[PDB]
Design a binder for this molecule. Structure first.
Ligand SMILES: O=c1ccn([C@@H]2O[C@H](COP(=O)(O)OP(=O)(O)O)[C@@H](O)[C@H]2O)c(=O)[nH]1
Length: 321
């Protein structure tokens, strides 16, 4: 069968969700399905402006009742109404906040699923011990660790934040580090070389593009990142309290309250203030860190992508009769 995913690569994709879904198909139903990201039986939109038009194309031909049209919402809160369309067979929601929002849009209960934000199946294989993961990455085994990243392209004031962290997580009365940093620069090669060439006074590992994010996050105790939905969902599955340091205008604004309101992290654009929060969490406010970690795990939706595609399967199995 033919699976057609569509998405605006013009930055906001969401690529991460599209590939995660494709990965889900291949791993679950094998060659039974054949998927393409961008003659389809099922059609998936992971974008807030590829609903109406792509739908009118199926209404003004009558190919609607033929092929299924779903939607995987990627904002986590305070969405843009354009995700919601009555002519949608199913609208997958990453949270109750959004589901209850879809209800207001007038989407019937049979049109709404709340499985969570789809994360790579390759991510969701379960936890390895923290000591082992750290050893594999060349990190110190015992020091609490903050993961610092900025999506696939390594955006954000990463260097300034790393510097602030280096000064903030060094105890000058024992003359040693009380914390450590794992930096993932993604595809930002320029940043990777800059950071790698500097001497850091606490343990700092600089990586480029990571494919086994699950392990990197598993090695750490909290995370600093821009408010990307994919990273947020991944961090919560790994019980990582989140310090959001900013967001891409329009695309990622609604994700901030989802983290803060649910007790899963904090927001701050100041490298210095961020480093203060981490030193606090790694020191006198460790209790708070654990509580936020627990909050994150309770909201984590590791099986999201599986439930979504299976529901997509049971859908095509019944539209072709
Ligand atoms: O070195 C890297 C950097 C990023 N990512 C992945 O890239 C995705 C980024 O998605 P997000 O929604 O957080 O950022 P956006 O797609 O909006 O740029 C996440 O799933 C990360 O796990 C990765 O696998 N390795």
């Amino acid at each position: 069968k033919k699976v057609l995913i569509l998405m605006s690569d013009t930055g906001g994709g969401h690529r991460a969700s599209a590939e995660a879904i494709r990965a889900a198909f291949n791993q679950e139903f094998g060659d039974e399905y054949q998927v393409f990201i961008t003659q389809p039986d099922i059609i998936i939109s992971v974008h807030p402006l590829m609903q109406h038009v792509p739908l009118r194309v199926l209404r003004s031909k009558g190919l609607l009742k033929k092929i299924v049209f779903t939607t995987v919402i990627t904002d986590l809160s305070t969405c843009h109404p354009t995700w919601f369309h009555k002519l949608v067979t199913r609208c997958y929601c990453p949270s109750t906040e959004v589901a209850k929002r879809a209800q207001k849009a007038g989407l019937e209960t049979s049109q709404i699923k709340v499985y969570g934000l789809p994360v790579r199946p390759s991510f969701v294989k379960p936890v390895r011990p923290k000591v082992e993961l750290r050893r594999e990455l060349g990190m110190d085994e015992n020091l609490p660790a903050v993961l610092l990243m900025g999506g696939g392209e390594g955006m954000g004031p990463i260097e300034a934040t790393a510097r602030a962290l280096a000064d903030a997580l060094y105890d000058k009365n024992l003359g040693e580090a009380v914390g450590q940093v794992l930096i993932i620069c993604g595809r930002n090669k320029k940043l990777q070389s800059k950071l790698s060439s500097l001497d850091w006074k606490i343990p700092v590992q600089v990586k480029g593009f990571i494919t086994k994010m699950e392990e990197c996050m598993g090695a750490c105790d909290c995370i600093i990142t821009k408010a990307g939905p994919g990273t947020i969902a991944e961090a919560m599955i790994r019980g990582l309290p989140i310090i959001l340091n900013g967001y891409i205008a329009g695309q990622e604004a609604g994700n901030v309250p989802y983290v803060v309101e649910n007790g899963c992290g904090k927001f701050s654009k100041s490298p210095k203030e961020i480093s203060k929060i981490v030193a606090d969490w790694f020191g006198p406010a460790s209790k708070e860190l654990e509580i936020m970690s627990q909050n994150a795990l309770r909201l984590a939706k590791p099986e999201a992508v599986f439930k979504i595609v299976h529901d997509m399967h049971e859908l095509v199995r019944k539209k072709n009769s």
